[PDB]
C-alpha cells in the first residue's frame, strides 16, 4: 500500500505543476518573445527589398533626389526660397520612391478604374504584403481564413483631392483613399481574419502598430501579424506646410546628431514585418530573423509646446521598455534613434539616452547610436519599422552600419560622459557569448513615444528535380522562370532546395509551367524556354488552369503497352514502385515459377514479352505499381476504369480485390489464354456499320470510339474480312496476339476458368468502379469469378464508360500504363461528350521514357492543368531555398489634377 509520504509527493507535485503552468501563462501574456519572421519594403532609390536596403546602408549611401516630375506637381510654381511665401516650398529635394504609381492591378483582382482611384499607399501595401509572406517561405494562399492580424501606421497625403469629381457607381473614390481600407484591403485580398487596424500617431505610428500587434499575438487574438507603415506623398503638401515653419533642412539632409542638423528631410516608404510568437514560429518551422523582446508607449504630456519633445518622457519610455522584458540598459548594444536631424530634438533624444543607457556604462562598450534617417530620410508613418528593418539587417549581417553626417557631433550635447558613441563608421557586431540586443525609438509630434527592444534570433545528389513555376499572366510566368533561371545560374544554388521551395512556399497560380531536370544546367535550359514562352523540350511543360483540383479517373488499358525493360529504372529509383512489384511477386508465387521483377530487369533465364501468360501478369503488376506511385504523390482516383484484363488492375486499385485474388484472376485467365494459342486473331478499325459487315461470318471485341473498333474471331475470316475493308477503304491494323478475346472462341475455357478462380472473395470497392462490361458503377462484391469470365467473354464498352464519366463531372483522366495506348481515344471521347470542356488526359510512362524523370514529367503535365501533386515526395531531405518574390507586371495609375 502507498505510504502517506508517497501520496503527499503526488499531491504536492500536482500543486507545483499547477503553479508552474500558471506562471508560464503569466509570462506568455506579459512578455512572450515575438519572432520577426520576415520583412519587405519600398524605399527611395529603388530600394525595393531588404537586401538592397542593407546594400545601401553598408556602403553609406544616401538616396536623396529632386522632386518627382511624373506626379503632376507644378514644380516651377512650387519652389520659392522665402519661408514666409504662402503655398511654396524652399526645398526641392526629398526621398521618393522609384515608381509610386506602378501597380499590378490584375494580380490583385482590381479593375483599372479602382486602381487609379486607389491611394498608392494602398497599392504598394498590397505588393509588399504579398512579398512579405513570400519572404517568410509561406505560400500566401495558406493564410486564407487564418487569424492573421494587420496593424499599420498610415495617414492621408491628399491623393486625388485635386481631381475633378466624377461618376463613381462603385464607390472606388471613398475606399480608395481611406486609411482604414489600407489595412482592411490587405485582409480582404489575402483572406485574413484577425483584427485589421490603421493607426496614426504621426512619426511613432508604425512602432505603435508594432506594440499593438505584439499585444494581439501574446493574447492569442492574432496567430501572426502584418505590421508596419506606409508614407507616399501624393502631393507636395508636407514640404509646403513645414516650409512655413522653417522646419525643413535646406539641403534636404537629415543630419541626425551632427552639428549641421537644421531640420527634417522627408521621405517615402512602405515597410512591413511579419510577426509571430517565437514559440509558434519554432513549432511551425518558420525562419526567425530576430526577436522583439519588449516595448513601451507613453506620452510627453504637458510638454513645452504641443509638438515639443520631452526628455523626461523619453527617459521613462526607455525604462518602461526595458522593464517590460526584464532587461537592464547594459544589455543593449545599440540604439536606432528617432534621429530626425532637428536642432531642438536631437540633443533631447541624445541626453535621454546619455541619462539612461549612458549612466554607469561599461567604459569599454559605449552604447552605439545611429539613425537610418541620415541615409534615407524621414519616412514618416513608416519611420519606426524602417529603423527596425535596419536593426534586423544589422543583426543578420553581423555589422552596425555607420550613421551619416556626424564628422562633428553636435556640441549641444555633452558627449563627455562617454556612455554613448555615434557610429561614425561601420562596427562589427558578431554573434558570440554576449547576446546582441538593440533598441528602436520613435517619438511623434503628437507626443506619443515608442521604444522597442530587439534581440538576435536564437542560435539555430543527382536525382531528378521537378521545378514548378506559376503566375497570374503569361508575361509574369516568363518573368518567374527567368528569375529562377538566374537563381540557378549561381554556384550557391541548391537544385533540390529550389524545387522544394517552389513547390511548398509559393502560391500555385493559373499559368503554370514545369521543368524536370537532374542538373542545374538542364534546369536552366528548361527554365529559359519557359522564360521565352516556349515548351519545345520534352523536359518542359506548360499549361493554364482555372481550378486547383480535379476529379480524377485512373484508366487501366489491356495489352499493347508493354515494352522490353519497361519500369526497370523505377525499381532502383522508386521504393514505392518496387515495393508494389515485390508484393505482386509474393502473391503470384504459388502459381508460377518466374518473377515479374526478373522479367522487368530482363534477368537471365527469365521469360520474354511474347507469351500472353507472362505479359498479362507483368502489365498487371506494372499498372497496379504505377497506380501506387501516383498515389504516393497524393493523386487518389475518384473512379477507376479498365479495358479487358485492365479491369483486374482497376478492381485491385479500387479495393474490390485483394492482391492475392487479383493475381489468381490474372494468372488463371492468362494461362488459359495460352491454351488458345494460334487459334484466334484480332484487329482494329463505326460499330453498327462493322456489324452489318460481319453478318456473312460468325467469328466485335471492343468499342473504343465511333471509328475505332476491335473485331475478334478465327484466323481465316480475319484475313477474308480484311480483304474487303482492304479493297474498299479504311485500314485494319492487326494485333500481336495468339488468340481471339471477347468472341465465342472463348467459351471452351469457361468451365475451367470458373473452377480455377471460383475461390476469390471480392470486397466492397473503396473507389467507384465503372465497369466497361455492364456499363455502370458496380459494387465490388459483384465482381466474382462469373463477372471475370463475362469480362473475358463480352464486348469492352470503353468509349461509353469514358463518356459516362465525362458527362458526370470527372475531368482528369490518367492512363496508368507503361505506354499511352488509350489517351487519344479518351481525348476524342471527352471532347464529343457533354462533359467539362477543360478536361485533362495524360499517361504515365512511354516506350522511350520509363524512368522517374518521365513519370515526374507526366505528373507535371497533369499538374499544369490543375491536378494537385505533392511535389515534396520527390524531394526527401531537401531544405527549401530562399527565392525571389512575385514578378509584378506594373502599369501606371495616377490621378492628376
Amino acid at each position, epitope marked *: *500500500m*502507498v505510504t*502517506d509520504s*508517497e*501520496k*503527499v*509527493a*503526488e*499531491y504536492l*507535485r*500536482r*500543486a507545483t*505543476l*499547477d503553479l508552474r*503552468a*500558471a506562471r508560464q501563462r503569466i509570462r506568455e501574456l506579459e512578455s512572450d518573445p515575438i519572432a520577426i519572421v520576415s520583412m519587405a519594403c519600398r524605399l527611395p532609390g529603388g530600394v525595393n527589398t531588404p537586401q538592397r536596403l542593407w546594400e545601401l546602408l553598408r556602403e553609406g549611401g544616401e538616396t536623396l533626389s529632386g522632386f518627382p516630375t511624373d506626379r503632376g506637381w507644378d514644380l516651377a510654381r512650387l519652389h520659392h526660397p522665402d519661408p514666409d511665401n504662402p503655398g511654396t516650398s524652399y526645398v526641392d529635394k526629398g526621398g521618393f520612391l522609384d515608381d509610386a504609381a506602378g501597380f499590378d492591378a490584375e494580380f490583385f483582382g482590381v479593375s483599372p478604374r479602382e486602381a487609379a482611384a486607389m491611394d498608392p499607399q494602398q497599392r504598394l501595401l498590397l505588393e509588399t504584403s504579398w512579398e512579405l509572406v513570400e519572404n517568410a517561405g509561406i505560400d500566401p494562399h495558406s493564410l486564407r481564413g487564418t487569424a492573421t492580424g494587420v496593424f499599420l501606421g498610415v495617414a492621408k497625403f491628399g491623393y486625388g483631392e485635386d481631381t475633378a469629381a466624377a461618376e463613381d457607381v462603385e464607390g472606388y473614390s471613398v475606399t480608395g483613399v481611406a486609411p482604414a481600407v489600407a489595412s482592411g484591403r490587405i485582409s480582404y485580398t489575402m483572406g485574413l481574419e484577425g483584427p485589421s487596424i490603421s493607426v496614426d500617431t504621426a512619426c511613432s505610428s508604425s512602432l505603435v502598430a508594432l506594440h499593438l500587434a505584439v499585444e494581439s499575438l501574446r493574447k492569442g487574438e492574432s496567430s501572426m501579424a502584418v505590421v508596419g507603415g506606409a508614407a507616399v506623398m501624393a502631393t507636395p503638401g508636407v514640404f509646403v506646410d513645414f516650409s512655413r515653419q522653417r522646419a525643413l533642412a535646406a539641403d534636404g539632409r537629415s543630419k541626425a546628431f551632427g552639428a549641421g542638423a537644421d531640420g527634417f528631410g522627408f521621405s517615402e516608404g512602405v515597410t512591413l514585418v511579419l510577426l509571430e510568437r517565437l514559440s509558434e514560429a519554432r513549432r511551425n518551422g518558420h525562419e526567425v530573423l530576430a526577436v522583439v523582446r519588449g516595448s513601451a508607449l507613453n506620452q510627453d504630456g504637458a510638454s513645452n509646446g504641443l509638438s515639443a519633445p520631452s526628455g523626461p518622457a523619453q527617459r521613462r519610455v526607455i525604462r518602461q521598455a526595458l522593464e517590460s522584458c526584464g532587461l537592464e540598459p547594459g544589455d543593449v548594444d545599440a540604439v536606432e534613434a528617432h534621429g530626425t536631424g532637428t536642432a531642438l530634438g536631437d540633443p533631447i533624444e541624445a541626453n535621454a539616452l546619455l541619462d539612461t543607457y549612458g549612466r554607469d556604462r561599461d567604459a569599454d562598450r559605449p552604447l552605439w547610436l545611429g539613425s537610418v534617417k541620415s541615409n534615407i530620410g524621414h519616412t514618416q508613418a513608416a519611420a519606426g519599422v524602417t529603423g527596425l528593418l535596419k536593426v534586423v539587417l544589422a543583426l543578420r549581417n553581423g555589422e552596425l552600419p555607420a550613421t551619416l553626417h556626424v564628422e562633428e557631433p553636435t556640441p549641444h550635447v555633452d558627449w563627455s560622459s562617454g556612455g554613448v558613441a555615434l557610429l561614425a563608421g561601420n562596427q562589427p557586431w558578431r554573434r558570440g557569448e554576449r547576446t546582441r540586443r538593440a533598441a528602436v525609438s520613435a517619438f511623434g509630434i503628437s507626443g506619443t513615444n515608442a521604444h522597442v527592444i530587439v534581440e538576435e534570433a536564437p542560435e539555430r545528389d543527382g536525382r531528378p528535380v521537378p521545378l514548378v513555376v506559376s503566375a497570374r499572366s503569361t508575361a509574369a510566368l516568363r518573368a518567374q522562370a527567368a528569375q529562377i533561371a538566374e537563381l540557378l545560374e549561381r554556384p550557391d544554388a541548391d537544385l533540390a532546395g529550389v524545387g522544394l521551395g517552389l513547390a511548398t512556399t509559393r502560391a500555385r497560380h493559373e499559368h503554370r509551367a514545369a521543368v524536370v531536370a537532374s542538373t542545374r544546367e538542364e534546369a536552366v535550359r528548361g527554365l529559359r524556354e519557359i522564360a521565352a514562352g516556349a515548351a519545345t523540350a520534352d523536359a518542359v511543360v506548360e499549361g493554364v488552369t482555372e481550378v486547383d483540383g480535379r476529379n480524377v479517373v485512373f484508366l487501366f488499358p489491356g495489352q499493347g503497352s508493354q515494352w522490353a525493360g519497361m519500369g526497370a529504372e523505377l525499381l532502383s529509383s522508386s521504393p514505392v514502385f518496387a515495393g508494389k512489384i515485390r508484393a505482386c511477386d509474393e502473391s503470384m508465387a504459388p502459381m508460377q515459377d518466374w518473377k515479374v521483377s526478373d522479367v522487368l530487369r530482363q534477368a537471365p533465364g527469365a521469360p520474354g514479352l511474347d507469351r500472353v501468360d507472362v505479359v498479362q501478369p507483368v502489365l498487371f503488376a506494372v499498372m497496379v505499381s504505377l497506380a501506387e506511385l501516383w498515389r504516393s504523390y497524393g493523386v487518389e482516383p475518384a473512379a477507376v476504369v479498365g479495358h479487358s484484363q485492365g479491369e483486374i488492375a482497376a478492381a485491385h486499385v479500387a479495393g474490390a480485390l485483394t492482391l492475392e485474388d487479383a493475381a489468381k484472376l490474372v494468372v488463371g485467365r492468362s494461362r488459359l489464354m495460352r491454351s488458345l494459342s494460334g487459334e484466334g486473331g484480332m484487329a482494329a478499325v463505326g460499330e453498327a456499320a462493322v456489324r452489318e459487315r460481319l453478318r456473312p461470318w460468325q467469328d466485335v471485341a471492343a468499342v473504343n470510339g465511333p471509328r475505332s473498333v476491335v473485331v475478334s474471331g478465327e484466323p481465316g475470316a480475319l484475313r477474308a474480312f480484311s480483304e474487303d475493308c482492304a479493297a474498299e477503304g479504311i485500314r485494319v491494323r492487326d494485333i500481336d496476339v495468339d488468340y481471339a478475346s471477347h468472341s465465342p472462341q472463348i467459351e471452351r475455357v469457361r468451365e475451367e476458368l470458373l473452377e480455377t478462380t471460383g475461390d476469390i472473395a471480392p470486397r466492397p470497392a473503396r473507389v467507384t468502379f465503372h465497369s466497361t462490361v455492364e456499363s455502370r458503377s458496380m459494387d465490388g462484391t459483384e465482381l466474382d469469378a462469373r463477372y471475370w469470365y463475362r469480362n473475358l467473354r463480352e464486348t469492352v464498352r470503353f468509349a461509353d464508360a469514358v463518356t459516362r464519366l465525362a458527362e458526370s463531372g470527372y475531368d482528369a483522366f490518367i492512363e496508368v500504363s507503361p505506354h499511352p495506348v488509350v489517351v487519344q481515344a479518351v481525348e476524342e471521347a471527352v471532347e464529343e461528350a457533354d462533359g467539362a470542356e477543360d478536361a485533362v488526359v495524360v499517361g504515365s510512362l512511354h516506350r522511350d521514357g520509363g524512368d522517374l524523370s518521365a513519370f515526374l514529367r507526366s505528373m507535371a503535365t497533369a499538374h499544369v492543368s490543375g491536378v494537385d501533386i505533392r511535389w515534396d515526395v520527390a524531394l526527401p531531405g531537401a531544405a527549401p531555398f530562399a527565392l525571389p518574390t512575385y514578378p509584378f507586371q506594373r502599369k501606371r495609375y495616377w490621378l492628376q489634377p
Partner: antibody
Amino acid sequence: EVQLVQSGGGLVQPGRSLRLSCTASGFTFGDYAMSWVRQAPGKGLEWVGFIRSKAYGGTTEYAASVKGRFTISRDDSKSIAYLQMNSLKTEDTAVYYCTRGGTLFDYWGQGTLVTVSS
Amino acid sequence: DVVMTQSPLSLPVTPGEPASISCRSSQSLLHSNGYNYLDWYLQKPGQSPQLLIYLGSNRASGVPDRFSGSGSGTDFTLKISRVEAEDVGVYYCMQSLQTPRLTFGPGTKVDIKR
C-alpha cells in the same frame, strides 16, 4: 504537452499472452508511478496494478484477480510502461487504461481494448 | 476497516443551471496535515476518465473553473456552477486515505434533465 499513447491489445485466445504498452511524452516519465486500470464492457473501473518510480523503489502491486498472471514493468529510457498479461481469461476482456500516478490519476491514456475469446 | 465512499446513483442536470454531487465516506478523510484525501474524477461516454478536483477542493490546471469541490470529514460536494451539455457522464468521488482503491464504484450518472 503530456501524452500517454497506448498500443498492443486486440483479440487473443484464452491461455495466451499479450503485452500492452503506454508510451509517454511531454513530462518526465521516470518521476511518476504508473498505473493500469481496466473497464469490462458496460461495467465499472477496476484497478489492475501499478509500478512505482525509481525514486520510491520501482516495485509493483497487483489486484488479487490478476496477481500471478499479469506483471507491470517500465523502461525509463524509452518512457514506456508495460502490462504483460499471461494466462488470459475471458473475464479479462476489457478496455485497459494506463494512467500517470499511483494515487492521483491526473492523466490517462486513451485505452486499449483487449478481447479474450476462442 | 475498509474505507468506502458513496454518491447518488443518478443526477439529472439542466445546462445553464448549477449542479451538486454529494459524497459521503465511511470514515473521516481529514488528515493531520489539514487536507481531506478525496479526489473527484469524471468519465465521459466513450472517453477515458479525467481528474477534476484533488484533496477535496483543489482544481487541477486545465479543468474548467465552473467545477469546484468542498466539504470536510465525511461529507463532500462537487459543485458545477453552470452545467454544460458536455458535462454528462459518470462522476466518481475517490478517497485516498486507504490504498489501493480496488474499484471506482458505481459513481454518479449525470444526464440531461427532462
